[PDB]
Design a protein around this nucleic acid. Structure first.
Ligand SMILES: [Mg+2]
Ligand SMILES: [Mg+2]
Ligand SMILES: [Mg+2]
Ligand SMILES: [Mg+2]
Ligand SMILES: [Mg+2]
Ligand SMILES: [Mg+2]
Ligand SMILES: [Mg+2]
Ligand SMILES: [Mg+2]
Ligand SMILES: [Mg+2]
Ligand SMILES: [Zn+2]
Lengths: 114, 94, 244, 60, 91, 69
RNA sequence: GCCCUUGAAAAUCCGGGGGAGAGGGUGUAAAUCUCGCGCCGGGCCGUACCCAUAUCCGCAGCAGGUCUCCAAGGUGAACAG
RNA sequence: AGUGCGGUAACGCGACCGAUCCCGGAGAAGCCGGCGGGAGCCCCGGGGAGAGUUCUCUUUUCUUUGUGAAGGGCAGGGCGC
RNA sequence: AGGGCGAAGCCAGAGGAAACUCUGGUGGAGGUCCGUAGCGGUCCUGACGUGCAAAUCGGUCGUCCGACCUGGGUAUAGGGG
């Protein structure tokens, strides 16, 4: 069996020195060094444990290269925050403001009464 | 007590358990009452509370936590929100 | 002869504290107009573990009331704190748990922790794990309050100085036996080089005052002056009474 | 020569008590033997259910 | 008592550490690994994450509690007192 | 490299300023048309032989057309 | 699953909230976290071989010591022999 | 009038103005077990090309039987959408 | 490496009026056992003893998921570490 060697002066098997086997057109198994696994961004909410959809999970210094559309999604808070947490933020932020208005109304009635 | 009057509603009346379904019942304008467990999420409650206000519907805050309410509907599962469409012969609705 | 283990811990070096993974200091919020006069509201963003500490902490985030900027703190978690809770603090703070307010406000019999020893110090007494202080009694003039510490002592304190209501979280840690030496090793490794401890009786008489002998005995009384030069002050220091 | 002998081992040969060094569990792990079975019987059951042979409640 | 008469959780430890210690550990060793009920959703998912910090997996509500129990007694008794005094102050 | 699907498209790519060699590989059953550019090596697979023979004439000003063997 | 252990920082890179501004006046503009193509550049130092029963350290081509990667068939539980 | 449009929605489409300021993410995480998918190698049954054996037997035994990165498509995994 | 023992949790079946208990599985805990590499260094009071060696060799041994082993970086210096 064809055993093989590392292709770089880094001898030690490390986070940096990860590999994979590949058959070339020359018909010799050769190590190719592999790129680290990128992660999708997690939500700005911080409770939803699941990572975001519609974003290319890639090593962050790549994002540079990528097009805008890969990096985000067409929504308010797009590619920063999961939908669920937006549509709860939305209705929360609305419902809160409706009660603030109700308390303002109850305050104004109390001033007019007194 | 409310547990007694519910018992009868669940037996004889028409009803619906859960938030996805009761919000659809209120939105239709069929729901005559809405029971909320006490442990219900605060956003959820206030949302429902507003939906009843728009549909001129009763909202009864249940004394117990969602496990107690589901127990109190005669289900082994747990229900946080429950709408009462048509009571059978109960006076749950006054 | 030798400088004894003990004298050596003062030079730091090897006996300094291990603090890489420690998440920060566990202070209180600094005083300001809002704290002083009203109450600032913040939310508990998360609850955290802090190596070498039995108490869990709480990332609590407020809004800086001068710059558009979300400042954050590390409170020691009052037991029963949780995330998505609000944490009000100031003079006009409501007397519920995980709510830092001056000792002078809060009534007698009120249990607190992370209690400021001197006003503005940012939380010094009773911040251990299952521990707390109790506000005894107030002297309205002199602006002073008496507080009972966990050691038992009944310290006098400025009524201005703050405390978080409730006890510290993670109580009863020390009810569990350790069992394994390993389990001891793993405790102190996230703290400092203080573990497997060798009895001065074991040592030769150059490295400890109890050392030497043909029998592992002390040879002199193990109680000792505290007007005692460092190198002898070993055993039971200034021991008022000694037995069971 | 090996291939010939492996064909003997297929027929059930050179496989008696006195040509075993490992424990039975080492030779065929009980867990694996279990895993096969569940993955069979369960597969049989959900094939039965999804042909309307057996109802929900029987299946369960 | 299917497998053991009287060790259960602390059968892991084998003979070691002495009978009293192992009996003493069994109380905690149980409670600390218990899955409690998240008084927030009501699922049985409150699980100690690290000392003094319990996390609901569903609720995602991390909760500063006891070292080996979601609630110490001390915490509970302190809670009620503070609630009583709060009401005594404000009226 | 880049494969192309329209005979017109390869003709447009061949007509650029940056282009050069437009070598032609008769594979049998295939007849490719590899046209190098600055960045990419465009190829075009033309399954018919007579259509490939027709295209052969349609390259413009005096490019290399370095047929491959 | 385990922890009275909770298990690195930073450079760098991106997303989102905001909306101060800018753009041309009905064929065009400013704009492209630019889409596709095109042009130009990337300096400095290391790069031989040994890496060990003979290129290293133990006065030596010394039974010692000295961090890693790859890892075929048979027998066999097996990186055992 | 015109700082792009599609989808109930998850989200999509080649581009789709924008400052100081703010929030977030990625960089950025322990060990151990179990199970699954993907490759490299081994194995088996055959096709070829060259071998060795041939006193007898052996459709033999042995070797060898390929496709880099980067793009595009599609399986195959996974989803706490 | 590979094996052994088989802790909690889980399933079924049987009994029990209940409390709960038995039987068969599954599950895979542990400063758990055997045992390789590794780390060590018991005995032979073996070899050697102007040695291979200014401490080595051989068998025999201890330990081998943990107070484990180990490279590089970094800290502590002489009545000092
Ligand atoms: Mg590196
Ligand atoms: Mg997208
Ligand atoms: Mg001695
Ligand atoms: Mg002395
Ligand atoms: Mg070289
Ligand atoms: Mg070599
Ligand atoms: Mg000897
Ligand atoms: Mg001699
Ligand atoms: Mg020799
Ligand atoms: Zn979310």
């Amino acid at each position: 069996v064809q055993r093989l060697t590392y292709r770089r002066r880094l001898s030690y098997n490390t986070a940096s020195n990860k590999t994979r086997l590949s058959r070339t057109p020359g018909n010799r198994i050769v190590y190719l060094y592999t790129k680290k696994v990128g992660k999708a961004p997690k939500s700005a909410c911080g409770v939803c444990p699941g990572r975001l959809r519609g974003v290319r999970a890639v090593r962050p210094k790549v994002l540079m290269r990528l097009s805008k559309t890969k990096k985000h999604v067409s929504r308010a808070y797009g590619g920063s925050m999961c939908a669920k947490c937006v549509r709860d933020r939305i209705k929360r932020a609305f419902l809160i403001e409706e009660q603030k208005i109700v308390v303002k109304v109850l305050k104004a009635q109390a001033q007019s009464q007194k | 007590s409310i547990n007694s009057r519910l018992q009868l509603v669940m037996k004889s009346g028409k009803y619906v358990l859960g938030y996805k379904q009761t919000l659809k019942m209120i939105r239709q304008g069929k729901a005559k009452l809405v029971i909320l467990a006490n442990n219900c999420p605060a956003l959820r409650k206030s949302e429902i509370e507003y939906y009843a206000m728009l549909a001129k519907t009763g909202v009864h805050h249940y004394s117990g936590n969602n496990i107690e309410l589901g127990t109190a509907c005669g289900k082994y599962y747990r229900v946080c929100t429950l709408a009462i469409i048509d009571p059978g012969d109960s006076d749950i609705i006054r | 002869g030798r400088v004894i283990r003990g004298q050596r811990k003062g030079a730091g070096s090897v006996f300094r504290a291990h603090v890489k993974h420690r998440k920060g200091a566990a202070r209180l919020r600094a005083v300001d107009f809002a704290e002083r006069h009203g109450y600032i509201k913040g939310i508990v963003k998360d609850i955290i573990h802090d190596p070498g500490r039995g108490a869990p902490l709480a990332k609590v985030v407020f809004r800086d009331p001068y710059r558009f900027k979300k400042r954050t703190e590390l409170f020691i978690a009052a037991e029963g704190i949780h995330t998505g809770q609000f944490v009000y603090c100031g003079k006009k703070a409501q007397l519920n748990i995980g709510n830092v307010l001056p000792v002078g406000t809060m009534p007698e019999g009120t249990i607190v922790c992370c209690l400021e020893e001197k006003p503005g110090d940012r939380g010094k007494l009773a911040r251990a794990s299952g521990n707390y202080a109790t506000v005894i009694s107030h002297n309205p003039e002199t602006k002073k309050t008496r507080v009972k510490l966990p050691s038992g002592s009944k310290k006098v304190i400025s009524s201005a100085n703050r405390a978080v209501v409730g006890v510290v979280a993670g109580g009863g840690r020390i009810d569990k036996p350790i069992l394994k030496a390993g389990r001891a090793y793993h405790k102190y490794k996230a703290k400092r080089n203080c573990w497997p401890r060798v009895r001065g009786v074991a040592m030769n008489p150059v490295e400890h005052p109890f050392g030497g002998g043909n029998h592992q005995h002390i040879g002199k009384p193990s109680t000792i002056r505290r007007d005692a030069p460092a190198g002898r002050k070993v055993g039971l220091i200034a021991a008022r009474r000694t037995g069971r | 020569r090996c291939r010939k002998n492996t064909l003997a081992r297929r027929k059930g040969r050179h496989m008696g008590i006195g040509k075993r060094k490992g424990t039975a569990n080492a030779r065929m792990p009980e867990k694996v033997t279990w895993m096969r079975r569940m993955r069979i019987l369960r597969r049989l059951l959900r094939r039965y259910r999804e042909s309307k042979k057996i109802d929900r409640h029987m299946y369960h | 008592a299917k497998r053991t008469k009287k060790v259960g959780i602390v059968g892991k430890y084998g003979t070691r550490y002495g009978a009293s210690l192992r009996k003493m550990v069994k109380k905690i060793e149980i409670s600390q690994h218990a899955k409690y009920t998240c008084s927030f959703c009501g699922k049985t998912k409150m699980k100690r994450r690290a000392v003094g910090i319990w996390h609901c997996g569903s609720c995602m509500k991390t909760v500063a509690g006891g070292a080996w129990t979601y609630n110490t007694t001390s915490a509970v008794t302190v809670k009620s007192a503070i609630r009583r005094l709060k009401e005594l102050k404000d009226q | 490299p880049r494969k192309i699907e329209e005979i017109k498209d390869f003709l447009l790519t061949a007509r650029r300023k940056d282009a050069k060699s437009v070598k032609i590989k008769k594979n049998k059953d295939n007849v490719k048309f590899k046209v190098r550019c600055s960045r990419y090596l465009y190829t075009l697979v033309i399954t018919d032989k007579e259509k490939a023979e027709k295209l052969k004439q349609s390259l413009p000003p005096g490019l290399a057309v370095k047929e491959l063997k």
